[PDB]
Design goal:
The complex is a heterodimer of chains A (257) and B (294). Chain A contains 14 helices and no strands. Chain A has 257 residues and is mainly alpha-helical. Chain B starts with a strand and ends in a 17-residue tail after the last helix. The chains are: A mainly alpha (257), B alpha+beta (294). The structure holds O6-cyclohexylmethoxy-2-(4'-sulphamoylanilino) purine. O6-cyclohexylmethoxy-2-(4'-sulphamoylanilino) purine is lined by residues 11-14, 19, 32, 61, 77-83, 86, 128-129, 131, 141-142 of chain B. Chain B: This is Cyclin-dependent kinase 2.
Chain lengths: 257, 294
């Protein structure tokens, strides 16, 4: 309470520094947006199986995008980068992270324990141990405190939309976590209650519906096309009563911005 | 990498790894070396390194370098000369002068406020982890038990904090704990610097709670709303009266007593923040003298 403003300010600084290179996928010879989408969808599955925090998923994705921003990776090694990143994210964030053996098992035994452990080392080296990165999730939980009154469906729907943004590098790589969270919270709020991005958050973030619009237009489309998207693990996940079955909710046809 | 360092002696053993005093041969800089023998890289090291690289403050031990050699991970820190615990033992017959206690507390609160403002919980404040130098600085060390927290907090690890410095909300098992647990530890350390004995030296969780209750009163719903509902609260708990707070740390005068009581408030919401404590009247005459010893 006495530190909310300081922390928010600090996270707004760090998200800029911790940001992946926007055009990195063009510079990768062997991997595509589609291959990355498959990877992230599989990580969602992994998180579901081991009951991992949503924050762990968001961190792992940040580690991967940052790693791939400087390191060229062949398609057959992409899943290894993804596996080490999720191991690292689990160690950072989880009370009880899964053991390394459990990460070897879920890779269908494509890789050995020694490969996973060497890739952990490399990821840490390449990221220079900077793992406390801001995520969409970390901004969402702060934005949730501005609901009047609190609504569980809005919260889960915001998390659902924020999670979908992880799947598609084009176009979400160009948006900062705080901005994506802004769009996601507004979209969830509007879908459930008919309400809009509140004045108190303009005050906090400096963002308005005008500055959120570009991201919001993209997120609206992704929401509309979600049942037809090739990757479905997030929709399946958000059917569960843990997240109030919010993926069953109908998107709005228009946003009237 | 390790070529330029000459080991001097072992200092001790923290959360994990071994710390050595060493000297940079080219610059002359004396450093502390945390050696980690390599389940992969430990989460405690992953947390410590990532957090310490963000935390740059005069009252937080400075991480200087991270060296990945063949089979081992070496962390290079600024060297400090002694821990607070050994310093208190050296003060057995003279005591610690008030200006020094006051200066140390003020510095620790600065260190803590910076941590909390950067979403970091230390979760292991105790005299052995508080390091002093010859110029009068005191610094937070051993971030192996630390973590980055969210706003609002989730449930985190329930093990946390060495028993003697462990907050009531941890002992009573609340779903959520936050920055207040570090403040509780500092309050215990404030009392300790004055009396030079531990405030609540229990050897079990129940013994710890009862010692706290006998000093501050058994908390009721008035002093701490929700307490009777907490997981590890028992209605059979003895109901001790809150004693004259001036009898808790007798040498302390009005301003110091006031600050200690705000640091040892039962309700984590009412417990003073490190940031707010910096402006307490207790610190109106604060200076930064060198240690009166060694
Ligand atoms: N015992 S003592 O009083 O003789 C003395 C104490 C500590 C040190 N020095 C020192 N120690 C560190 O961690 C040592 C470690 C010991 C175990 C618990 C955690 C702290 C450091 N980390 C960065 N810099 C450090 N400097 C010198 C002398």
């Amino acid at each position: 309470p006495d530190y909310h403003e300081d922390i928010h300010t600090y996270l707004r600084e760090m998200e800029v520094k911790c940001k992946p290179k926007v055009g990195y996928m063009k510079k990768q010879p062997d991997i595509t947006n589609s291959m990355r989408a498959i990877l992230v969808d599989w990580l969602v599955e992994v998180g579901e199986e081991y009951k991992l925090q949503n924050e762990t998923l968001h961190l792992a994705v940040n580690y991967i995008d940052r790693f791939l921003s400087s390191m060229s990776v062949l398609r057959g090694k992409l899943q290894l980068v993804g596996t080490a990143a999720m191991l690292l994210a689990s160690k950072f964030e989880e009370i009880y992270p899964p053991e390394v053996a459990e990460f070897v098992y879920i890779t269908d035994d494509t890789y050995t324990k020694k490969q996973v452990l060497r890739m952990e080392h490399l990821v840490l080296k390449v990221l220079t141990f900077d793992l406390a990165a801001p995520t969409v999730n970390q901004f969402l939980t702060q934005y949730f405190l501005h609901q009047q009154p609190a609504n569980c469906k809005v919260e889960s729907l915001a998390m659902f939309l924020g999670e979908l943004s992880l799947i598609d590098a084009d176009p979400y790589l160009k948006y900062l976590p705080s901005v994506i969270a802004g769009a996601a919270f507004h979209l969830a709020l509007y879908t459930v209650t008919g309400q809009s991005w509140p004045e108190s958050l303009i005050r906090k973030t400096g963002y308005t519906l005008e500055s959120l619009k570009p991201c919001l237009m993209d997120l609206h489309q992704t929401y509309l096309k979600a049942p037809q998207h090739a990757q479905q693990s997030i929709r399946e996940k958000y059917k569960n009563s843990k997240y109030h079955g919010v993926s069953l909710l109908n998107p709005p046809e228009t946003l009237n911005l | 990498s390790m070529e330029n360092f000459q080991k001097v002696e072992k200092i001790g053993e923290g959360t994990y790894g071994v710390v050595y005093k060493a000297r940079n041969k080219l610059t002359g800089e004396v450093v502390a070396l945390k050696k980690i023998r390599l389940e992969g890289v430990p989460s405690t090291a992953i947390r410590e390194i990532s957090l310490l690289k963000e935390l740059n403050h005069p009252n937080i031990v400075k991480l200087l370098d991270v060296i990945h050699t063949e089979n081992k991970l070496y962390l290079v820190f600024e060297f400090l000369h002694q821990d607070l615990k050994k310093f208190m033992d050296a003060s057995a017959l003279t005591g610690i002068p008030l200006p020094l206690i006051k200066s140390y507390l003020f510095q620790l609160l600065q260190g803590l406020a910076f941590c909390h403002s950067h979403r970091v919980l230390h979760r292991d404040l105790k005299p052995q982890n508080l390091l002093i130098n010859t110029e009068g600085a005191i610094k937070l060390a051993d971030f192996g038990l630390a973590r980055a927290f969210g706003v609002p907090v989730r449930t985190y690890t329930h093990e946390v904090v060495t028993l003697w410095y462990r907050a009531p909300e941890i002992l009573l098992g609340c779903k959520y704990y936050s920055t207040a647990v570090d403040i509780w530890s500092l309050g215990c350390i404030f009392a300790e610097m004055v009396t030079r004995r531990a405030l609540f030296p229990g050897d079990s969780e129940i013994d710890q709670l009862f010692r706290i209750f006998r000093t501050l009163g058994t908390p009721d719903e008035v002093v701490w709303p929700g307490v009777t509902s907490m997981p590890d609260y028992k209605p059979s708990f003895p109901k001790w009266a809150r004693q004259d707070f001036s009898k808790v740390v007798p040498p302390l005068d009005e301003d110091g007593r006031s600050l200690l009581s705000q640091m040892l408030h039962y309700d984590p919401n009412k417990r003073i923040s490190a940031k707010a404590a910096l402006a307490h009247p207790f610190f109106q005459d604060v200076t930064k003298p060198v240690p009166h010893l060694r």
